[PDB]
Amino acid sequence: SKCNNEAFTLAQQHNKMEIYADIIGSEDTTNEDYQSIALYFEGEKRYLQAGKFFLLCGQYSRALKHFLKCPSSEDNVAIEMAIETVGQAKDELLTNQLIDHLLGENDGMPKDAKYLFRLYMALKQYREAAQTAIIIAREEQSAGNYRNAHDVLFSMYAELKSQKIKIPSEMATNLMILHSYILVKIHVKNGDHMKGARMLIRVANNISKFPSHIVPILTSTVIECHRAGLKNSAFSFAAMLMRP
Amino acid sequence: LDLYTAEQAFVRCKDYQGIKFVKRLGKLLSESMKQAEVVGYFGRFEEAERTYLEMDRRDLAIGLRLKLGDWFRVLQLLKTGSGDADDSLLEQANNAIGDYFADRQKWLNAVQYYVQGR
C-alpha cells in the first residue's frame, strides 16, 4: 500500500522468510531510511545486500565499509553501486577510504582503474578524472595494447565531453596520437601509402610514446615512406634506426 | 587592446613594426590570445608563458620559448604533458643546448648533450 513496514511486518513475520524480503526490494520495499530491510538482510553475516538496501536513504555509511572491507571483488555491481554511493556527494572520509581501496595499496589486487575515473566523475572533480584517464591510457599504450588503450581513452574522452567539460590538451594529444596509430593499420590495409605514411610519420615523431614497439613501427614507417615517395623521411627514420 | 587608437599612434611614430604587429593581432580572433600576445610584446616573457600554460596551451608556451633561446625551458616544459612531436622537439632542444655550450668553449657540457640528442 503506502505502508512503511506493514507488508514487511508480515515478511519479518512469515517466520522471517528470506524470499519475501528478496522480492519486496525490487519494486518498492519501505521508507524512513529503509532501516528495516537494512537489519533484515544484514543478519546472519549477510553483509552484501544491506549496502544495496542502504542506498535508499542515509544508512549507507554503515555497509559502505562492509563493501570496502572486501580486499577483492566480492561483487562488481556492488563495487559500482558503492562508487555511486560515494557519488551521492556526502564528502565523507569513507570517500577517501574507497579511493585508497580502489588504489589497492591496502589490498594488493585492485580491479581495473576505470572505477577510479567513474568515482572522480561522480564526485565532479574533473581535474583528477582527466589525469586518471591519461594515466590509464598511457599505461595501456606502454604495455603494447594500442587498440585497447585507444578504446578506453576514447570512451573516457566521450564521457568527459558529454558533460560539456573543457578537455585538457594532454588528453586530446594522447587521443590524437593513439588514433593516428590506429589509422596507420587501416590506411596500410587499403594500400593507400600516402595516408599511412603521413600517419606513420606522425607516430614516429612520438615513437617514445610507443616504447614496446619502437623498433617494428619505425621499420614499417621507412617502408611506407619508401612506397609513398617520402624518401627523405625514410632516410631520416632509418638513420635514427641505426643508433646502437 | 583598442587596436585602432594603437594603430593610429603607431602611424604617428612611423613604427611599421607596431603597425604590422597590431594588424597580426587583429587578424587573431581570441581574447587572452591577444592578451598573451601583448604581454609578450612588452617583454614579460615569463608572464606570457604562464598565461599560455593557464589557458591550457603548452603548445604556444613551447613556441614562445622556441622563438627565444630558452632551450632549458623547453626541456623543462617537455618533461610534463604531451605534444604532437616531442621526440624531434627534444632532440632539437638537446642539439641547441649542445651548440649553446660549445660556442662558449664549454665542452664536457655540450658533450652531455649531443648524446641525448643525436
Q: Are A68 and A98 within 8 A, CB to CB? A: yes
**CB-defined contacts A:B, below 8 A:** 37
Instruction: Please give the DSSP secondary-structure letter assigned to residue B1.
Output: -
d(CA A133, CA A124): 14
Q: Which residues of B touch A209 (CB under 8 A)?
A: 82, 86
Tell me, yes or no, if A174 comes closer than 8 A to chain B by beta carbon. Answer: yes
Q: What angle do CA A153, A154, A160 make, to 5 degrees?
A: 90
Q: Do B59 and A169 touch (CB under 8 A)?
A: yes
The residue type found at B76 is: Q
Neighbours of B56 (CB within 10 A): 14
d(CA A88, CA A122): 8
Tell me, yes or no, if B82 comes closer than 8 A to chain A by beta carbon. Answer: yes
Write the Ramachandran bin of A34: left for phi over 0, alpha for psi from -120 to 50, otherwise beta: left
d(CA B88, CA A216): 19
Tell me, yes or no, if A170 comes closer than 8 A to chain B by beta carbon. Answer: yes
d(CA A118, CA A135): 14
Residues listed for chain A: 244
Residues listed for chain B: 118
SS3 state at B47 = helix
Closest Cβ–Cβ partner in A176, A205, A243 for B87: A205
**How many helices and strands, by DSSP H and E, does chain B display?**
7, 0
Q: Which residues of B touch A208 (CB under 8 A)?
A: 86-87
Final resolution, Å? 3.7
Residues 6+ apart with CB under 8 A from A123: A86, A87, A89, A95
Q: Do B118 and A173 touch (CB under 8 A)?
A: no
Q: Do B118 and A205 touch (CB under 8 A)?
A: no
Q: Do A177 and B82 touch (CB under 8 A)?
A: yes
Phi, psi of B106 (to 5 degrees): -120, 45
Burial B86-114 (b: 16+ CB within 10 A, else e): bbbbbbebbbbbbebbeeeeeeeebeebb
- DSSP letter for each residue of A53-122: HHTTTT-HHHHHHHHHH-SS-S-HHHHHHHHHHHHTT---HHHHHHHHHHHTTTTS----THHHHHHHHH
SS3 state at B43 = coil
Residues 6+ apart with CB under 8 A from B112: none
The residue type found at B1 is: L
Half-sphere exposure of B96 (CA within 13 A, CB side): 17
CB < 8 Å & 24+ apart, contacts of A114-123: A114/A152, A114/A156, A115/A79, A115/A80, A115/A83, A117/A156, A117/A159, A118/A80, A118/A83, A119/A83, A119/A86, A119/A87, A121/A159, A121/A160, A122/A83, A122/A84, A122/A86, A122/A87, A123/A86, A123/A87, A123/A89, A123/A95
Neighbours of B26 (CB within 10 A): 14
d(CA A136, CA A113): 7
Closest Cβ–Cβ partner in B56, B88, B118 for A169: B56
Closest Cβ–Cβ partner in B58, B81, B87 for A207: B87
The technique by which this structure was obtained is: cryo-EM
Instruction: Please give the DSSP secondary-structure letter assigned to residue B28.
Output: S
Tell me, yes or no, if A209 comes closer than 8 A to chain B by beta carbon. Answer: yes
Half-sphere exposure of B81 (CA within 13 A, CB side): 20
SS3 state at B69 = coil
Cell 565531453 -> residue: A161
Mutant choice from A126, A177, A181 vs B, greatest count of B C-beta within 10 A? A177
Q: How far is A210 from chain B (nearest CA, A)?
A: 12
Helix, strand and coil content of chain B, in percent to the nearest 5, comes to 65, 0, 35
- For residue A96, what are the CA distances in angstroms to A78, A79, A86, A136, A148? 18, 15, 9, 20, 29
Give alpha helix (H) positions in chain A.
6-16, 18-27, 35-42, 49-54, 60-69, 76-87, 93-103, 114-123, 126-143, 146-161, 169-189, 193-204, 214-227, 231-241
Phi, psi of B56 (to 5 degrees): 55, 50
Q: Are B101 and B109 within 8 A, CB to CB? A: yes
Residues 6+ apart with CB under 8 A from A204: A217, A218, A221, A237
SS3 state at A139 = helix
Closest Cβ–Cβ partner in A168, A174, A205 for B88: A205
Burial A33-63 (b: 16+ CB within 10 A, else e): ebbbbbebbbeeeebbbbbbbbbbeebbebb
Q: Are A11 and A20 within 8 A, CB to CB? A: yes
* Cell numbers describing residue A82: 558503492
Residues 6+ apart with CB under 8 A from A48: A41, A66, A74, A75, A78
Q: How far is B17 from chain A (nearest CA, A)?
A: 33
d(CA A53, CA A34): 7
Q: Is the dihedral of CA A60, A65, A67, A68 positive or negative?
A: positive
Tell me, yes or no, if B50 comes closer than 8 A to chain A by beta carbon. Answer: no
* Cell numbers describing residue B69: 633561446
Cell 603548445 -> residue: B59
Instruction: Please give the DSSP secondary-structure letter assigned to residue A213.
Output: G
